[PDB]
Amino acid sequence: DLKSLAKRIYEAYLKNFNMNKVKARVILSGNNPPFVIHDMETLCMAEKTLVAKLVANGIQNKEAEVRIFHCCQCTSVETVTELTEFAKAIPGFANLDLNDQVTLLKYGVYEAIFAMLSSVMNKDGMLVAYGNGFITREFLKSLRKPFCDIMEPKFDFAMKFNALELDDSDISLFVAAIICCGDRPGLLNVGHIEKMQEGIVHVLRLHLQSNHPDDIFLFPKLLQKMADLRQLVTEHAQLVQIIKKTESDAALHPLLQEIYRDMY
Ligand SMILES: CCCCCCCC/C=C\CCCCCCCC(=O)O
C-alpha cells in the first residue's frame, strides 16, 4: 500500500502543479522559448509581451522593482491555489476540520513554494511566467534595496537542494510532508495531524530508500531541509513586512496578507 500511496501523491503533483522538474529542465536545456531578462531593457520588453496590463499605464506604471515584486506575488498566489488542491491527495488531510486545513496550508505554503522554486532555478537564473521567461540571478541582485534581497537566499537554498538530485516523485512526497507538520501554531486536532504526518513521512522514508539507494542519509538531509525552509520563511516574512511598512506602492495581495498575518 505504501508504494501505491507514493504513486498517488506523485500523480497528484503532476496534475496540480503547472511546473514540474522535468518540464523545467526541458525549457532550461534549450515553440515558445523563454525570453531572457538580464537588464532593464529586457525586463521592459518581457513585460510588454508577458504581463502587458501591468505596463499599460503610461507614466502611471509603477517602479520596475515594484512591478517585479507584484509578479512574484502573482506566482505565490497561483502556487497557493495549486497547493490547496494538491493537499486533498494527502491521506487524512481532507478529513481534518476546515480550520486545521487552513492552518496547515497557512504555514506550509511558503515552505513548499521555496522548495519547488529550486526546480526552476539554476546558478544563473530562474524560470518565470509559466516557463516563458528566464530572469537572471545577477539582474535580481541588481535591483534597488530592499527588492534585491528577496531572491538571493532562495537561490542559495536551491543550489544545495538541487545537488541532492531529487526527482518529481521525491519532491511530491517532500511537499506533502511539509504540509503535514503537527507543530504549526494554533492547530486544534494535533493528535490526528501527528498521525497524518507520521504516515506521509513513512511513505517518504521508504520511497527515498528505494529511489536513492546511493545516499543513505537522504531522509535526514531532507528533514534538515524542512527546518531550513521554516527559517527561510520566517526571514522572508520579516523582509515582506519591511517592504509593507516602507514601500507604499508595493501592494500586498489580500490572500498573501492573510497568510502572513500572525504567522511568525
Ligand atoms: C516579466 C516577468 C517578471 C518576473 C519577476 C520575477 C518573478 C519571480 C517568480 C517567483 C518568485 C518566487 C518568490 C515569491 C516570494 C515573493 C512574493 C511573496 O512574498 O509572495
Side-chain angles (χ1 to χ4, degrees), residues 1-58 60-264:
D1 51 329
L2 289 319
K3 187 161 194 255
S4 172
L5 169 53
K7 181 178 181 186
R8 175 216 294 190
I9 296 291
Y10 179 30
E11 285 173 4
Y13 161 103
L14 291 176
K15 182 180 111 184
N16 283 299
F17 295 104
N18 76 82
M19 189 54 62
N20 59 65
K21 188 162 180 178
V22 171
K23 187 185 300 192
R25 282 176 163 193
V26 170
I27 297 162
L28 289 168
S29 76
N31 167 233
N32 282 292
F35 182 88
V36 173
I37 298 167
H38 64 85
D39 64 1
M40 284 295 170
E41 173 178 88
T42 51
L43 173 69
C44 292
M45 292 165 66
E47 294 169 317
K48 284 179 187 196
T49 297
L50 298 178
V51 288
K53 182 77 175 171
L54 184 63
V55 291
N57 312 290
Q60 304 288 320
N61 285 344
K62 312 282 196 77
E63 184 176 16
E65 282 86 352
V66 169
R67 302 196 307 260
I68 288 167
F69 187 59
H70 183 75
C71 290
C72 292
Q73 292 181 59
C74 290
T75 309
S76 299
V77 163
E78 296 293 357
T79 309
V80 168
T81 303
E82 298 178 330
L83 283 157
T84 300
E85 178 73 10
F86 172 68
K88 298 183 183 167
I90 299 174
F93 186 88
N95 315 108
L96 298 169
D97 180 285
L98 304 175
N99 290 320
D100 276 348
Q101 299 183 32
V102 167
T103 298
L104 290 176
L105 287 166
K106 173 191 184 69
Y107 282 90
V109 55
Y110 275 105
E111 294 175 11
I113 286 166
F114 297 146
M116 292 185 296
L117 214 53
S118 315
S119 298
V120 295
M121 285 174 154
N122 63 34
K123 63 186 156 67
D124 292 326
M126 65 188 292
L127 299 176
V128 300
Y130 294 83
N132 289 290
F134 178 84
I135 188 160
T136 67
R137 186 177 183 173
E138 283 300 322
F139 179 62
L140 290 168
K141 286 170 58 170
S142 85
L143 298 181
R144 75 160 173 87
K145 290 194 96 66
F147 297 96
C148 53
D149 299 328
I150 292 164
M151 209 66 69
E152 191 62 6
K154 283 67 162 184
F155 278 107
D156 282 342
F157 176 89
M159 294 306 93
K160 296 180 293 180
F161 195 74
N162 284 347
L164 304 180
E165 289 294 6
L166 302 183
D167 62 38
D168 291 302
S169 72
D170 309 312
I171 294 161
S172 64
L173 289 171
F174 184 70
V175 173
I178 285 166
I179 290 174
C180 299
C181 287
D183 67 335
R184 300 315 191 177
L187 294 168
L188 71 102
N189 189 351
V190 168
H192 288 182
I193 296 171
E194 287 177 349
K195 303 299 177 179
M196 179 184 64
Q197 173 173 25
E198 187 190 59
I200 284 278
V201 172
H202 185 50
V203 180
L204 173 68
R205 190 181 55 78
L206 294 166
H207 179 80
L208 297 171
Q209 185 179 347
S210 299
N211 200 35
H212 294 270
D214 48 321
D215 186 348
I216 65 172
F217 279 88
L218 186 54
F219 175 66
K221 284 174 191 187
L222 288 175
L223 295 176
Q224 179 187 73
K225 295 309 187 188
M226 299 181 52
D228 294 346
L229 284 161
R230 193 177 290 196
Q231 185 63 28
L232 195 69
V233 176
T234 301
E235 296 169 343
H236 181 75
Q238 288 161 354
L239 177 62
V240 173
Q241 173 68 9
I242 290 185
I243 293 168
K244 181 175 181 192
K245 295 262 277 241
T246 63
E247 302 287 342
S248 61
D249 277 317
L252 214 52
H253 190 290
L255 190 80
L256 308 180
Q257 174 77 112
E258 180 57 40
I259 288 171
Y260 285 123
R261 201 260 293 144
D262 299 316
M263 191 198 270
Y264 289 114

mmCIF file of all heavy atoms in Angstrom, residues 77-102:
data_model
loop_
_atom_site.group_PDB
_atom_site.id
_atom_site.type_symbol
_atom_site.label_atom_id
_atom_site.label_comp_id
_atom_site.label_asym_id
_atom_site.label_seq_id
_atom_site.Cartn_x
_atom_site.Cartn_y
_atom_site.Cartn_z
ATOM 1 N N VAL A 77 0.498 33.477 -5.314
ATOM 2 C CA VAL A 77 -0.944 33.259 -5.222
ATOM 3 C C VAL A 77 -1.345 32.051 -6.046
ATOM 4 O O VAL A 77 -2.157 31.223 -5.606
ATOM 5 C CB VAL A 77 -1.712 34.514 -5.675
ATOM 6 C CG1 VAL A 77 -3.208 34.173 -5.986
ATOM 7 C CG2 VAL A 77 -1.583 35.638 -4.643
ATOM 8 N N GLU A 78 -0.780 31.921 -7.241
ATOM 9 C CA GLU A 78 -1.104 30.757 -8.069
ATOM 10 C C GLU A 78 -0.615 29.465 -7.422
ATOM 11 O O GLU A 78 -1.334 28.450 -7.407
ATOM 12 C CB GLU A 78 -0.497 30.926 -9.454
ATOM 13 C CG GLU A 78 -1.083 32.135 -10.245
ATOM 14 C CD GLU A 78 -2.549 31.984 -10.636
ATOM 15 O OE1 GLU A 78 -3.172 30.911 -10.368
ATOM 16 O OE2 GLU A 78 -3.080 32.953 -11.253
ATOM 17 N N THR A 79 0.600 29.489 -6.857
ATOM 18 C CA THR A 79 1.126 28.269 -6.244
ATOM 19 C C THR A 79 0.317 27.911 -4.994
ATOM 20 O O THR A 79 0.090 26.720 -4.695
ATOM 21 C CB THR A 79 2.648 28.444 -5.963
ATOM 22 O OG1 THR A 79 3.304 28.901 -7.163
ATOM 23 C CG2 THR A 79 3.280 27.078 -5.582
ATOM 24 N N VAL A 80 -0.184 28.910 -4.274
ATOM 25 C CA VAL A 80 -1.070 28.620 -3.147
ATOM 26 C C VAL A 80 -2.329 27.855 -3.602
ATOM 27 O O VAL A 80 -2.729 26.858 -2.968
ATOM 28 C CB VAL A 80 -1.398 29.934 -2.421
ATOM 29 C CG1 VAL A 80 -2.534 29.731 -1.448
ATOM 30 C CG2 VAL A 80 -0.144 30.430 -1.708
ATOM 31 N N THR A 81 -2.955 28.275 -4.715
ATOM 32 C CA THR A 81 -4.111 27.575 -5.274
ATOM 33 C C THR A 81 -3.764 26.130 -5.623
ATOM 34 O O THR A 81 -4.530 25.204 -5.328
ATOM 35 C CB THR A 81 -4.620 28.309 -6.505
ATOM 36 O OG1 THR A 81 -4.922 29.657 -6.122
ATOM 37 C CG2 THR A 81 -5.860 27.605 -7.106
ATOM 38 N N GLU A 82 -2.612 25.926 -6.286
ATOM 39 C CA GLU A 82 -2.204 24.575 -6.683
ATOM 40 C C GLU A 82 -1.962 23.712 -5.459
ATOM 41 O O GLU A 82 -2.395 22.549 -5.409
ATOM 42 C CB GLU A 82 -0.928 24.647 -7.551
ATOM 43 C CG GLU A 82 -1.133 25.438 -8.876
ATOM 44 C CD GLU A 82 0.141 25.550 -9.721
ATOM 45 O OE1 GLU A 82 1.261 25.568 -9.163
ATOM 46 O OE2 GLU A 82 -0.008 25.655 -10.964
ATOM 47 N N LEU A 83 -1.300 24.277 -4.436
ATOM 48 C CA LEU A 83 -1.001 23.507 -3.217
ATOM 49 C C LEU A 83 -2.272 23.113 -2.475
ATOM 50 O O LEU A 83 -2.337 22.028 -1.871
ATOM 51 C CB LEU A 83 -0.083 24.322 -2.310
ATOM 52 C CG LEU A 83 1.412 24.384 -2.705
ATOM 53 C CD1 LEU A 83 2.183 25.605 -2.140
ATOM 54 C CD2 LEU A 83 2.121 23.101 -2.246
ATOM 55 N N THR A 84 -3.275 24.000 -2.468
ATOM 56 C CA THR A 84 -4.531 23.710 -1.782
ATOM 57 C C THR A 84 -5.246 22.512 -2.405
ATOM 58 O O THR A 84 -5.791 21.658 -1.689
ATOM 59 C CB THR A 84 -5.413 24.975 -1.804
ATOM 60 O OG1 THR A 84 -4.716 26.034 -1.142
ATOM 61 C CG2 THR A 84 -6.733 24.744 -1.094
ATOM 62 N N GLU A 85 -5.228 22.407 -3.736
ATOM 63 C CA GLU A 85 -5.831 21.249 -4.397
ATOM 64 C C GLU A 85 -4.965 20.001 -4.234
ATOM 65 O O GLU A 85 -5.482 18.905 -3.988
ATOM 66 C CB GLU A 85 -6.048 21.548 -5.872
ATOM 67 C CG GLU A 85 -6.627 20.394 -6.678
ATOM 68 C CD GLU A 85 -8.102 20.130 -6.405
ATOM 69 O OE1 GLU A 85 -8.758 20.945 -5.722
ATOM 70 O OE2 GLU A 85 -8.606 19.086 -6.881
ATOM 71 N N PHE A 86 -3.638 20.150 -4.343
ATOM 72 C CA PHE A 86 -2.740 19.031 -4.102
ATOM 73 C C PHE A 86 -2.977 18.387 -2.736
ATOM 74 O O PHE A 86 -2.923 17.164 -2.622
ATOM 75 C CB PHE A 86 -1.279 19.523 -4.233
ATOM 76 C CG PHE A 86 -0.254 18.497 -3.828
ATOM 77 C CD1 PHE A 86 -0.059 17.348 -4.592
ATOM 78 C CD2 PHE A 86 0.521 18.682 -2.676
ATOM 79 C CE1 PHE A 86 0.897 16.386 -4.247
ATOM 80 C CE2 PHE A 86 1.515 17.737 -2.300
ATOM 81 C CZ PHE A 86 1.679 16.550 -3.101
ATOM 82 N N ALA A 87 -3.197 19.200 -1.692
ATOM 83 C CA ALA A 87 -3.309 18.686 -0.334
ATOM 84 C C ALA A 87 -4.444 17.691 -0.205
ATOM 85 O O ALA A 87 -4.393 16.827 0.677
ATOM 86 C CB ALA A 87 -3.499 19.858 0.632
ATOM 87 N N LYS A 88 -5.470 17.800 -1.046
ATOM 88 C CA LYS A 88 -6.560 16.807 -0.981
ATOM 89 C C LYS A 88 -6.075 15.380 -1.192
ATOM 90 O O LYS A 88 -6.762 14.425 -0.779
ATOM 91 C CB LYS A 88 -7.613 17.112 -2.029
ATOM 92 C CG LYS A 88 -8.245 18.456 -1.796
ATOM 93 C CD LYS A 88 -9.329 18.696 -2.812
ATOM 94 C CE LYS A 88 -9.938 20.068 -2.656
ATOM 95 N NZ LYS A 88 -10.760 20.356 -3.890
ATOM 96 N N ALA A 89 -4.930 15.186 -1.845
ATOM 97 C CA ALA A 89 -4.465 13.836 -2.105
ATOM 98 C C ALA A 89 -3.765 13.213 -0.908
ATOM 99 O O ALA A 89 -3.465 12.016 -0.949
ATOM 100 C CB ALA A 89 -3.512 13.815 -3.302
ATOM 101 N N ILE A 90 -3.446 14.000 0.121
ATOM 102 C CA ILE A 90 -2.691 13.519 1.266
ATOM 103 C C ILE A 90 -3.651 12.776 2.184
ATOM 104 O O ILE A 90 -4.624 13.380 2.643
ATOM 105 C CB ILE A 90 -2.025 14.685 2.006
ATOM 106 C CG1 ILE A 90 -1.050 15.431 1.082
ATOM 107 C CG2 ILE A 90 -1.390 14.185 3.336
ATOM 108 C CD1 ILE A 90 -0.473 16.685 1.708
ATOM 109 N N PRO A 91 -3.421 11.495 2.491
ATOM 110 C CA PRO A 91 -4.368 10.765 3.335
ATOM 111 C C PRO A 91 -4.588 11.486 4.645
ATOM 112 O O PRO A 91 -3.635 11.805 5.370
ATOM 113 C CB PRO A 91 -3.684 9.406 3.544
ATOM 114 C CG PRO A 91 -2.888 9.205 2.322
ATOM 115 C CD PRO A 91 -2.346 10.618 2.006
ATOM 116 N N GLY A 92 -5.861 11.708 4.955
ATOM 117 C CA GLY A 92 -6.264 12.305 6.196
ATOM 118 C C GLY A 92 -6.484 13.796 6.129
ATOM 119 O O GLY A 92 -7.121 14.352 7.026
ATOM 120 N N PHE A 93 -5.917 14.466 5.122
ATOM 121 C CA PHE A 93 -5.974 15.923 5.115
ATOM 122 C C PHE A 93 -7.403 16.416 4.953
ATOM 123 O O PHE A 93 -7.847 17.305 5.687
ATOM 124 C CB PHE A 93 -5.085 16.464 3.990
ATOM 125 C CG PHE A 93 -4.968 17.979 4.006
ATOM 126 C CD1 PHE A 93 -3.982 18.585 4.765
ATOM 127 C CD2 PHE A 93 -5.864 18.769 3.285
ATOM 128 C CE1 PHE A 93 -3.879 19.986 4.818
ATOM 129 C CE2 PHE A 93 -5.762 20.200 3.347
ATOM 130 C CZ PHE A 93 -4.781 20.777 4.109
ATOM 131 N N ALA A 94 -8.130 15.852 3.983
ATOM 132 C CA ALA A 94 -9.499 16.272 3.753
ATOM 133 C C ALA A 94 -10.430 15.837 4.881
ATOM 134 O O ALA A 94 -11.542 16.371 4.964
ATOM 135 C CB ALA A 94 -9.989 15.721 2.429
ATOM 136 N N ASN A 95 -9.982 14.944 5.768
ATOM 137 C CA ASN A 95 -10.800 14.568 6.914
ATOM 138 C C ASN A 95 -10.622 15.496 8.102
ATOM 139 O O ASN A 95 -11.376 15.378 9.083
ATOM 140 C CB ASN A 95 -10.508 13.112 7.366
ATOM 141 C CG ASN A 95 -10.424 12.149 6.197
ATOM 142 O OD1 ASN A 95 -9.349 11.676 5.849
ATOM 143 N ND2 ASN A 95 -11.554 11.893 5.551
ATOM 144 N N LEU A 96 -9.645 16.414 8.052
ATOM 145 C CA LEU A 96 -9.430 17.362 9.134
ATOM 146 C C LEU A 96 -10.503 18.438 9.127
ATOM 147 O O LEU A 96 -11.132 18.719 8.101
ATOM 148 C CB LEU A 96 -8.067 18.039 8.999
ATOM 149 C CG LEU A 96 -6.841 17.148 9.065
ATOM 150 C CD1 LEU A 96 -5.585 17.937 8.642
ATOM 151 C CD2 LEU A 96 -6.632 16.581 10.447
ATOM 152 N N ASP A 97 -10.698 19.043 10.298
ATOM 153 C CA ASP A 97 -11.510 20.243 10.393
ATOM 154 C C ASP A 97 -11.003 21.301 9.413
ATOM 155 O O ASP A 97 -9.787 21.448 9.205
ATOM 156 C CB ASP A 97 -11.485 20.755 11.839
ATOM 157 C CG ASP A 97 -12.303 22.020 12.035
ATOM 158 O OD1 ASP A 97 -11.835 23.105 11.619
ATOM 159 O OD2 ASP A 97 -13.419 21.941 12.617
ATOM 160 N N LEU A 98 -11.939 22.021 8.789
ATOM 161 C CA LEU A 98 -11.558 23.069 7.843
ATOM 162 C C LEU A 98 -10.534 24.034 8.437
ATOM 163 O O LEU A 98 -9.599 24.464 7.743
ATOM 164 C CB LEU A 98 -12.793 23.844 7.374
ATOM 165 C CG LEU A 98 -13.918 23.021 6.736
ATOM 166 C CD1 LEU A 98 -15.135 23.899 6.426
ATOM 167 C CD2 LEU A 98 -13.433 22.279 5.480
ATOM 168 N N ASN A 99 -10.681 24.399 9.719
ATOM 169 C CA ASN A 99 -9.764 25.388 10.287
ATOM 170 C C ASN A 99 -8.338 24.861 10.378
ATOM 171 O O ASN A 99 -7.377 25.632 10.256
ATOM 172 C CB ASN A 99 -10.235 25.825 11.670
ATOM 173 C CG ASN A 99 -11.497 26.652 11.610
ATOM 174 O OD1 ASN A 99 -11.662 27.498 10.730
ATOM 175 N ND2 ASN A 99 -12.401 26.407 12.546
ATOM 176 N N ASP A 100 -8.186 23.566 10.635
ATOM 177 C CA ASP A 100 -6.862 22.968 10.676
ATOM 178 C C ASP A 100 -6.273 22.860 9.280
ATOM 179 O O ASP A 100 -5.057 23.025 9.110
ATOM 180 C CB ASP A 100 -6.930 21.591 11.336
ATOM 181 C CG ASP A 100 -6.882 21.661 12.873
ATOM 182 O OD1 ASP A 100 -6.574 22.724 13.448
ATOM 183 O OD2 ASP A 100 -7.098 20.592 13.478
ATOM 184 N N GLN A 101 -7.095 22.527 8.285
ATOM 185 C CA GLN A 101 -6.603 22.570 6.903
ATOM 186 C C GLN A 101 -6.055 23.951 6.574
ATOM 187 O O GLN A 101 -4.972 24.091 5.984
ATOM 188 C CB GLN A 101 -7.722 22.217 5.922
ATOM 189 C CG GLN A 101 -8.306 20.818 6.117
ATOM 190 C CD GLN A 101 -9.385 20.479 5.068
ATOM 191 O OE1 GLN A 101 -9.327 20.925 3.923
ATOM 192 N NE2 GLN A 101 -10.383 19.680 5.466
ATOM 193 N N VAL A 102 -6.785 24.989 6.969
ATOM 194 C CA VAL A 102 -6.338 26.349 6.689
ATOM 195 C C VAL A 102 -5.003 26.633 7.373
ATOM 196 O O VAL A 102 -4.082 27.183 6.759
ATOM 197 C CB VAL A 102 -7.424 27.352 7.121
ATOM 198 C CG1 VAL A 102 -6.843 28.762 7.130
ATOM 199 C CG2 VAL A 102 -8.619 27.248 6.201
#
